[PDB]
Amino acid sequence: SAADRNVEIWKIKKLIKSLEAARGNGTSMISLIIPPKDQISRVAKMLADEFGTASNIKSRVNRLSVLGAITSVQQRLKLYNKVPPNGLVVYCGTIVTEEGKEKKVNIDFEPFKPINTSLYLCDNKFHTEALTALLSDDSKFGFIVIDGSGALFGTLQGNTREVLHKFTVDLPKKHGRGGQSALRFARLRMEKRHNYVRKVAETAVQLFISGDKVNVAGLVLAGSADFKTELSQSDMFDQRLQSKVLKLVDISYGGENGFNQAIELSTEVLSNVKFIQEKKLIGRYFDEISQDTGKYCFGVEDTLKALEMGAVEILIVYENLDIMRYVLHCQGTEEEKILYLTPEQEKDKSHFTDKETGQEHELIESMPLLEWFANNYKKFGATLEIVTDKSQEGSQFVKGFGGIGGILRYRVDFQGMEY
Amino acid sequence: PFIPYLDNLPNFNRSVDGPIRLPIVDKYKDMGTVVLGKLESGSICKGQQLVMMPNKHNVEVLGILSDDVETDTVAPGENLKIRLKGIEEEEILPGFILCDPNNLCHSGRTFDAQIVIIEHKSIICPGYNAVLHIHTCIEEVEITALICLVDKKSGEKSKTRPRFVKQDQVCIARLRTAGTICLETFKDFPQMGRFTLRDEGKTIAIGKVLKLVP
Amino acid sequence: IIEPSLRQLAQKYNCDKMICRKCYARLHPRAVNCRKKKCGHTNNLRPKKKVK
Amino acid sequence: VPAAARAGAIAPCEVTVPAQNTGLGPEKTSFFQALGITTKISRGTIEILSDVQLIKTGDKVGASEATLLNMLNISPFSFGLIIQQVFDNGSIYN
Amino acid sequence: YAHFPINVVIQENGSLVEIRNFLGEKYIRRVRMRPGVACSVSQAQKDELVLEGNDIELVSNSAALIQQATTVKNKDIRKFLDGIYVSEKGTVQQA
Amino acid sequence: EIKVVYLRCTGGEVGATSALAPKIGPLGLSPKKVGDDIAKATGDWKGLRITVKLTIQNRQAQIEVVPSASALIIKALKEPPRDRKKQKNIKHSGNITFDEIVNIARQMRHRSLARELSGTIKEILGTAQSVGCNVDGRHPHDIIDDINSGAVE
RNA sequence: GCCAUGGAAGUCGGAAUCCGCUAAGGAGUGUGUAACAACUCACCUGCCGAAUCAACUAGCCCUGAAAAUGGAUGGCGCUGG
Ligand SMILES: [Mg+2]
Ligand SMILES: [Zn+2]
């Protein structure tokens, strides 16, 4: 399914960060990604001879890890019938962790989609970097920012915005020198401005060209007072590139905010991007907040209560978040219940106690909130919208409003409506 | 009429000797480097050592035309022409101001201000960017935290932290520029302090600069 | 721009109505059957959608 | 018991609206300034200058003229029980 | 009306009605009242027609004539709330 | 600013969910520390809910006990006190005495929130039926107990 | 209101559904509400004075009912037949 696919993209992102985080105290793990074409017999041959060699490495801890890891992966493939289709991930090792845990480890899996790596790595940590590279599939979009003040170059992923380079040039200004020069000032100044244009042009060729062929997918030129148009129409600007001029964008003051505005003018050009869909959705959500219609709902305290009652058209959530619900549980009455506690009251506080009875009150195995939405969103009837916290609106709503909220089915004025 | 009314009107702050300052408007090379700007504070006795701000370079001013006349001394509050013998030349900004080398002027990355929001118009959540306008100085800026709302008429500022603010509500807010930048106080210099909020074809807000974080 | 009384007045004559599911006709709000013969005095109505 | 003022029933006598503060923040002045009552912004908070009698003997109480009685919840004349005649063992008293 | 003001003028001592600048249209509506009807602009009111007469039928039909004459074609009427509308029906002298 | 407020509190037991900040919050005293102080001052009801009034000022709150009808009948019952959770299948088992109900009718008539004996026993027992009990029989029983077996002064 | 619950305080669920003034007032139809606010509902006084209201069923008529040379209750025509 498609919705389950997107759940795997975030789920895989979260799993990968862990596989990358685990560490050895002073030892090496074998990571072995086997590709789909090979035969098991051939793998057992290549490795059994590499095995008779690994038989005589000098170190004790490394040697035993290699030799024991080779026997383990063979036993894991003894579990695998054939090199399975579309890849084979394998991760054997001896990971130490906090609390002093000399832990042996074996993590074997058929991959979900085709995987290309033919990894072999006796190393301190595991590697699903292949998985995240496989997950992040969208082209990078460069941005050139020009101004009489100074330049700036920056790229643009699906959600993430990056900055590549920026610089200055001391182009002396219009007043320059009066009487004698003023009449021939605009001509000399246009030459000098064009020389600045040559330098900007050179940077765009450097960046956006790749062997007279663009490697990055899009290129958004940008400037004010017709800086970008000279860059577009200039002959230094490459013809194969004129074929692919995606857009030129005007800005004010000249810079990063203007870089952001030029992205806002782009919006319709980056329709495929979730960042653009987010910009448009959160643009409507702020239109709801501006208007009195009272569709908005906000905060986990109110939004989760609002979700429970229903009423929720769009539930805007950051894909990671890391906020939790403390499920309390009793012995006798069997009343499981969730509680949303602030940073002060959650960490150091005496509210998880029965007190009346005279006991300390526990909680039971929690669950992720986003995985819970994906599990039972059709039950509630709410449009889950996956946002990051990188973008100006997503990062903002993420920091202040818990990276969660929603457009409601109807009006609920909170200042009007006590309770 | 207008110019006769100026003749009958002497009501203007001369801007008199204080800690010497000179905000730099623009620059160019004509056998050196001339720059323009209104002396918001203090004096500058041409053959004398200045320092710029906030990047902080020592610098001697080669020549001046008080608007259109060669002079040695000058009091503040005047559109001055100032040609420098720059040791630092190409990483100077239009906007970095000269100050006294001893009586330095504050400048700072973090600062608080009472902003009166005219037209964002969207909600102004923590972390929006614009440009910060300080008469000659001008840097791109972001606001990290949003302290609180305040009324326009009879302004008694509230206790509890608000969750958001809509288009018009006035508020006290902290503004972080990208780089180092010339900021003054409303008490010390309002001429040095009153600043702008800026993005698209939309005026965001007026700003009221209060603090200078070092 | 315009007074809310005179607004609600135009709401009266244009927006506050009922529709026949069948012939998409326009009826008075406190109706029970349609008027048109082509639909057959249908009980099946709905209120006109209010503009936001 | 003084109940809410009705925006609609007939008036036996003149209904009155005394000069008294609203008890709110910045609100829409159009309800008071529509009719004809002097209302000033005494620093944010609105203050009433002059006293004017809106409704006369026998007049329909509008919602706008009703709103200030609904805010005060103070009837000029209370809903009640009116005496007709006394009757004592076959004896009428006017 | 919302934005464009409707310049109204009476011809033939309240028999005829010229209505100009409706939605900024160049067409102008020369509406004719019925016989035995007296159109009149009231005083002390900015936007107020007054139709007087004996026969209610002729009065009310002529009212609907002007009403349906000023009608918005091809547009969302729920939004564009323009045009003349009847407010208060009463008598010349009360009883 | 004085303000009275009704609260069907969990009792001596500290309730998880609170409805105190919406009514109390605008005035001034912190709502939860009062909720805990109210449950601590209460105590002997312990598990079951009590309608706690709160006369609130700008600085701080004031507590006043209002024993409910259903609550006073179940205390007449000897019940297990329980936590906020209040387990399922709590049908009350015992006998509400007719004299005890007359006493609770006197308690509600003392708060001055209902009728002369006929009405106040009924409101307290109609809520008792919500409790899930019997006054050695329901009102069909008490009609016969009333007839030729009256407990009236 | 208790039980549910987090809250059903008239308006998920689930337990409730007895009493008061009574002319009548549900632990509540909708808008609008987690429940109130604001608009609003069942129920009754004021006047009113004879027949009224609900659900079904079958009789006639109507809707449902579109095809190609110009067209057929046999035609003309027929509505106190
Ligand atoms: Mg159209
Ligand atoms: Zn129809």
UniProtKB/Swiss-Prot annotation, chain A:
Pfam families: eRF1_1, eRF1_2, eRF1_3. There is a cross-link at K274 (Glycyl lysine isopeptide (Lys-Gly) (interchain with G-Cter in ubiquitin)). The modification 4-hydroxylysine is found at K58. GO terms for biological process: nuclear-transcribed mRNA catabolic process, nonsense-mediated decay; regulation of translational termination. SUPFAM superfamilies: L30e-like, N-terminal domain of eukaryotic peptide chain release factor subunit 1, ERF1, Translational machinery components. Hydroxylation at Lys-58 by JMJD4 promotes its translational termination efficiency. Methylated at Gln-180 by N6AMT1. GO terms for cellular component: cytoplasm; cytosolic ribosome; translation release factor complex. A motif (NIKS motif) lies at residues 56-59. The modification Phosphothreonine is found at T342. It is found in: Cytoplasm. The modification N5-methylglutamine is found at Q180. Component of the eRF1-eRF3-GTP ternary complex, a ternary complex that mediates translation termination in response to the termination codons. The eRF1-eRF3-GTP complex binds to a stop codon in the ribosomal A-site. ETF1/ERF1 is responsible for stop codon recognition and inducing hydrolysis of peptidyl-tRNA. Following GTP hydrolysis, eRF3 (GSPT1/ERF3A or GSPT2/ERF3B) dissociates, permitting ETF1/eRF1 to accommodate fully in the A-site, followed by hydrolysis of peptidyl-tRNA. Belongs to the eukaryotic release factor 1 family. This is Eukaryotic peptide chain release factor subunit 1. The lineage of its organism: Eukaryota, Metazoa, Chordata, Craniata, Vertebrata. The gene is ETF1.
From Swiss-Prot, chain D:
P0 forms a pentameric complex by interaction with dimers of P1 and P2. Identified in a IGF2BP1-dependent mRNP granule complex containing untranslated mRNAs. Interacts with APEX1. Interacts with FMR1 isoform 6. The gene is RPLP0. Transmembrane segments: none annotated. Belongs to the universal ribosomal protein uL10 family. This is Large ribosomal subunit protein uL10. It is found in: Nucleus; Cytoplasm. It comes from Oryctolagus cuniculus. Ribosomal protein P0 is the functional equivalent of E.coli protein L10.
Curated annotation (Swiss-Prot), chain E:
It comes from the Eukaryota. GO terms for biological process: cytoplasmic translation. GO terms for molecular function: rRNA binding; structural constituent of ribosome. GO terms for cellular component: cytosolic large ribosomal subunit. Keywords: Acetylation, Cytoplasm, Ribonucleoprotein, Ribosomal protein. It is found in: Cytoplasm. The keyword Amino-acid biosynthesis does not apply. The keyword Transmembrane helix does not apply. The modification N6-acetyllysine is found at K26. Component of the large ribosomal subunit. The ribosome is a large ribonucleoprotein complex responsible for the synthesis of proteins in the cell. Belongs to the universal ribosomal protein uL6 family. Component of the large ribosomal subunit. This is Large ribosomal subunit protein uL6. It comes from Oryctolagus cuniculus. The chain holds residues 96 to 190 of 192 of the full protein.
